[PDB]
Amino acid sequence: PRAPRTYSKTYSTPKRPYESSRLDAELKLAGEFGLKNKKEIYRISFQLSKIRRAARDLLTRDEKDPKRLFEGNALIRRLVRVGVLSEDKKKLDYVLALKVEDFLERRLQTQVYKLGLAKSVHHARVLITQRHIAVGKQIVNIPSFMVRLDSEKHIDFAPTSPFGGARPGRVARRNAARKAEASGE
Template sequence: KAARVLLTLDAKDPKRIFEGAALLRRMNRYGLLGEEELELDFVLQLTTQKLLERRLQTKVYKQGLAKSIHHARVLIKQRHIRVGSQVVDVAGFGVRTSSEKHIDFAVN
């Protein structure tokens, strides 16, 4: 929605430039947009599938830490998964691209 509002503004509008850059930077940090897609038009083309791929639950399953997507959710809820040094118990946690390689079992 923010991208749609920003696109209605003039291309030289300071609000569009500042907030647009912040939005694109955030989308890039979370891996929703690639380096070649850093334009507001690409934000409107994001799919639900792409958002779901960035969830911790999906990442735990895809990295082979869990046998199924449901098992991944249980492991996360029971606080067996950490991202970096932080134990995370929210399956919908948005994983940044920089944190992706730090997903591991928690040492309880």
């Protein structure tokens, strides 16, 4: 009799599963961003469809309606603060013009690759998963962190994670011990 815990699924599979154009576009996106499967594309498409539905039934509402003003301004503020929507496109017909790779650009994996420090997208994903990147002072090991605009200057190496100093890792430690006991004396 405990109060129920609400859950919800955050992706939706396409209605027509075998068509060549959508499949090749999905593989294009997965190759250029370095994705594990198609579920990331489905997740972005699902939440973008949610955003587009909200924008549509606010644009159907009459102008100067207080609900339209409040929800539209909140939606534009949120999608600028995330960083997907540009600074010069703060309108509703312009948030209807959003695309999937615009959302996929703002991932931590793509943002840690594009800011140097990774030299590849798959190297960026491997570098993130192995707990090497901290936003501010918080270590993040998730490729889909969706970096804000205000923290773009804070993606750096962790205070842990030997690429940022602080006591090099296990393989180098074992190699140093091997060279010390064998080539030392």
